[PDB]
């Protein structure tokens, strides 16, 4: 949403671009646009939805 995706080697995070502070990737750290086919160098990784545990109550 504003930041970079980065990986430590095993896990994927999102950071602000001027200081390394790794956050878990979520539907509110991010925004969608379209299918995966269009984008060069896209990677397969899980995005966490913060509503899913709460709506599961």
């Amino acid at each position: 949403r504003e930041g970079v995706f980065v990986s430590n080697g095993t896990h994927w995070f999102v950071t602000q671009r001027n200081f390394y502070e790794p956050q878990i990737i979520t539907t509110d750290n991010t925004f969608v646009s379209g299918n995966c086919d269009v984008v060069i160098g896209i990677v397969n990784n899980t995005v966490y939805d913060p509503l899913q545990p709460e709506l599961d109550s």
């Binding site: 970079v4 671009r17 925004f31 646009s33 379209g34 269009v38 984008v39 060069i40 160098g41």
Partner: protein, 50 residues
């Protein structure tokens, strides 16, 4: 100097003009061809006249 991939540098230059970075990645081949073509016009502009 901090390295960054050129298509990711261009995404952060697109966010700088208020155009959301997916508008680059979804059009990256078009934007690359328009840039390569526009540098080609500079060679003609400087070759054909002083």
């Amino acid at each position: 100097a901090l390295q960054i991939p050129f298509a990711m540098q261009m995404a952060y230059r697109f966010n700088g003009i208020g155009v959301t970075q997916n508008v680059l990645y979804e059009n990256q081949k078009l934007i690359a061809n328009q840039f390569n073509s526009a540098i080609g016009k500079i060679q003609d502009s400087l070759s054909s006249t002083a």
